[PDB]
Structure formats: structure tokens, C-alpha cells
Symmetry: none
RNA sequence: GUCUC
RNA sequence: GUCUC
């Protein structure tokens, strides 16, 4: 869980996230490239949802690490470290 | 490079605008074919960057590259321009 | 310019033909080095512009230039010609 | 767990 | 000619 750090505190827009499969892609607002995001990377989840998720089109803040199969998001939160909004496909508690 | 099919319809799966490549899913064979920026024949006239967009229907020829099938002469259906990526600014 | 390493194998991370530069990730140290189009020693004869291509394996020396570690005498593995970039048109 | 419930 | 066609 110690993967090299390529960039820190990057702002991105969730392109899409699939709750069933537990991954999606965030598009970096600076470079407009996609970054793979797994459901385990989400640090400050929506407290009203049990499952970890981000929702399509949501603004998120994160670090980029060199993952096992490419660049990966980690430490994903809302802007300024607030909880994410979560996917509308992730059920509320 | 040998021609494997002409005038096929496919759905763009994703396209990376920072480095200019993505993949198309052919609607007949459901295989994936690589698409490079340089293979787009009829680009969106309103955008400077040459690109295609996720989910877009495109029409293309398919050739055999080193590492797999590649799209070429890529257009929108009927030869009209592609829509291009949401991540490529308009002029 | 002082030499930091000779005969390094690396993988092109990206190379922009329009601006004439890119980065190579060294296969031994996994560090990035800058490469300018003037540093390519064995270009692909069948492309007009000088370039290397995304994901290609290159062999080079590492010098320290004005703005950081820099790649020089860039060839393909063993000194053969590089493959070059898809963005560099073929003759 | 790399282009979708 | 130091993170982009």
C-alpha cells in the first residue's frame, strides 16, 4: 500500500463510477486525463451511505500514485477534505 | 498495413486527449480496435484538438497493426465529422 | 555537459512531436529523464520529423543539462533506429 | 480492481 | 527546448 507518488492534491471530475463493480475514472481538471479509482481509495465517504463510492460528475480531490496496472487515485475526498457526495447508485443507510 | 474491414460502425469506448489515443468497440464483431488521433479523417471543425468522444458512434476502416487491429479513416456515420471529446475545448 | 550514465535502457513515457520533447522513464532506476528531439541519434529513416514514440524502448546516456537530467545519444535498443512517433508522418 | 450497476 | 500535438 506504499505506491510511488506522482502528484498530490489534484482536483478532478468523476467521469463515471460503477458501484456494483466498485471502480471508475476521475478526469483531472488540470491535465484532462483519466485516473483509475477503486472503491477502496475513497477516504472521506458520504456518512449516510454504507458503501464507499463517488458519483458521476462530482468534484473530488486526491493524490495520484503509481498503481499496479497504472496511475491510480488515492486519499479521495471532496474539495478541501469534506466527504464526497457518493454515487446515487450507492444506497443510503 | 493489410485491410481487415472497410466502412464498419463502432462505439467509442474511451479516448485520452492528453496523449491522443483510445479504443473503439466494433458493433459487428464486438472486438476492440485501437484508434489514434492521426487516424481521424473528419474531425470536429469547431475544436482545434483532434479527438473522438466516449460513447460516440463512428465509422471507419480496420487495419492490422503490430499489436492488434487499428481503426483508420475515422468519421462519424455517413462520413459526417465526429463529435470529438468533451475534454477537447471548442474554439 | 557532465555524464551521469551510459547505455541506459528506458521506456518512452510520452513524446510530443509538435513541441519536440518528452520524457523517458529509466528501466533501471525508474526515474524520468527529459529528451529533446535534437538528442535522437538514430531516427526512423521512414519518418520526416525526428521523434520517439509512446511506450517504445530506447537506449541512451544520461547527462546533466541546464534544466535537469537529460537523455542524449538516443537510439533503439542496442543502437538500432528508434521506431518514432505515430504523430510523425511517414514518407 | 482499467471503460459501467 | 522540462508535462503536451
Amino acid at each position: 500500500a506504499d505506491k510511488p507518488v506522482l502528484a498530490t492534491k489534484v482536483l478532478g471530475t468523476v467521469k463515471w463510477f460503477n458501484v456494483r463493480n466498485g471502480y471508475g475514472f476521475i478526469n483531472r481538471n488540470d491535465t484532462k486525463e483519466d485516473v483509475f479509482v477503486h472503491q477502496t481509495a475513497i477516504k472521506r465517504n458520504n456518512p449516510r451511505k454504507f458503501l464507499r463510492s463517488v458519483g458521476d460528475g462530482e468534484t473530488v480531490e486526491f493524490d495520484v500514485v503509481e498503481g499496479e496496472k497504472g496511475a491510480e487515485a488515492t486519499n479521495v475526498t471532496g474539495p478541501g477534505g469534506v466527504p464526497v457526495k457518493g454515487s446515487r447508485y450507492a444506497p443510503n443507510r
